[PDB]
Amino acid sequence: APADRLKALVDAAVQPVMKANDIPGLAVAISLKGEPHYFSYGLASKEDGRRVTPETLFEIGSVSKTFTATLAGYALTQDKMRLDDRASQHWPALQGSRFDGISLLDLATYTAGGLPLQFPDSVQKDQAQIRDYYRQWQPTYAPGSQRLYSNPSIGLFGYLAARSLGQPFERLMEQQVFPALGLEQTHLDVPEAALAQYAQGYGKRDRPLRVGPGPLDAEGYGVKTSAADLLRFVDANLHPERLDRPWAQALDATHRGYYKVGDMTQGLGWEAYDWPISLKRLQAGNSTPMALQPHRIARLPAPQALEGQRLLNKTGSTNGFGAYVAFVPGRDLGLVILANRNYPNAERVKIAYAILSGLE
Template sequence: MKHTLKKYAISALLLGAGSCMAATDMRQVVDSHVTPLMKQQGIAGLTVAVVQHGRVQYFNYGVAAKDTQAPVTENTLFEIGSVSKTFNATLGGYAQAIGKLKLSDMTSQHLPVLAGSAFDRISLLQLATYTPGGLTLQFPDAADSATTMMEYFQHWKPTYAPGEQRLYSNPSIGLFGYATAKSLGLPFTVAMEKTLLPKLGLTNTYTRVPADKAGLYAQGYDSQQKPVRVNPGALDFEAYGIKSSSQDLARYVIANMHPQTLEQPVQQAIATTHAGYYTVNGMTQGLGWERYPYPVALQALLEGNSTPMAMEPHKVNWLKPAQAQPANVLYNKTGSTGGFGAYVAFVPSKDMGVVILANKNYPNAERVKVAYAILSAMDN
């Protein structure tokens, strides 16, 4: 095992084929990576769900809150940050599947308040894939509320031609979710909690945590170990505001790998999120999800989830038509709020995936390394 774990640490290692791994062996793999990570990063609580061939193993560490010392379990609710974007995207795919919108529609077609603005020429697909022309990562402070965001969008001018550059953006995919909800005739939170989540079989995932579930909601901690929870902001639920558990996200991973078990419109929605719309370096952009050819090198995942990918514009190469899910790919998405860090990755062709949730925001690279080691162990 020592030799195997050392082998997993080599950044150029390619994930290959393998079979199901015993629970005791997986415990050793997960412990050996998570225990030092939590100490190094000052993480109070963390949960890992390992999905393989329809079976799920849970590995829970530390506490959900320091004051109560409540232990983390697979039912503990964590803020999942931008993993929320994959739910937003799936809702959009569902709206398209039932005929409420087309990704090729111009944004102002569904949001008349934006008629006469740049969004007459920006498609829903461009919003969902961060290519409207330079919407930045966050709203300006003055626009970061439900009452001020539309005026911001009405006056916003693209820096680049729509569809030309990828610039990762909460306002961009957030507006996509907002337009999707409008097409369904529902507030986003209602469309998510009453329509999509039940259809995915998720029972412990929320936009707003209900009062009777408050005891499950982990306390997040910032870099100074001060308690923090996600702040309200413009399009927060659409872009980064969902809370979920490792158990529900494991179900979500299984649904993504086995959509044939779901009703037809949801199957179509998942296929829409898994499609490839353009490439940037070694990454192919889906809706919400980001995908890589499989086997994949650790370095490719680190680069795809790096700060430059989140903060800098990148020229895109559109795939026309959009490319359906290839035979061998890995999907992943990171998510962060002020006090939480999340990572989800899965490989449909190998029927395996991993969910990592923590009540501290720590570097994406560390999450990717742990997940990579776990996936490698399953596929060894």
């Protein structure tokens, strides 16, 4: 039976990696030939024995940036902002700062000139502290030259896109973005009535870990969603034309590459690779040096359509969770892997590659 073969393929990819990385619970969702398939493993909470299901909520960390990118795509389609706008055009407090010479594109693609991975610990989740942080910041190098993966960078991009729409970022995601995408199990602030679905996260010595408040957390890493909802988001990405036009264009804006770093082409949120490509190369593109070190970019002469024979992906983590999303536009194939342990990106890619290969 084809169901037996598919279960065998996914189990063979997942089971050893869960055991090796001591993952308590893991949800897989696959979109194949326009049909969804779910595979759920282990426990959402070890303490109460709640099992993972396709409706369990996981923290997706940096995968949130693809949602942030979608909201910015919507602001672009509505002509409320342009990627070449100066960042300070959208926030008067930034006028006269170094943000007068940094574009929204630089912010979105981590090339603003050395904005750090995280806000310093001295910056709390407070509007005035965030404002003052950006007003005083000075680039280490020229904007548009080096990519340094950064939550304050794309966080500001999302914050400015929301300002361009005249509403708070979190309100726009809840009231407009998630409903437009048909996402009813996707949250920035999990409702009390949905808490029973929120998985526990696990760190060292199995300490419980759920993400706490931080500056621009919603924009950079704040989404909690189920494997079923994240697959719905992947399916919207595979077929933007099925949504109402403004939202179709918003999703299309996240499928455009601006530059290359090694085998990776950088879009808004999504990162793309030629497909097929070796597992080692895909792991190297999602490796620690890509997250922690600056890289000189190879700018494209024109934005490149991220479609056809390409794999678009995003890793995301929080202290207690590890997520991975990947899809092949030219093959109508999509995958979501959500876990309640922050396990190495290389291991997430290893599961995904075994599944994607087996399906091919």
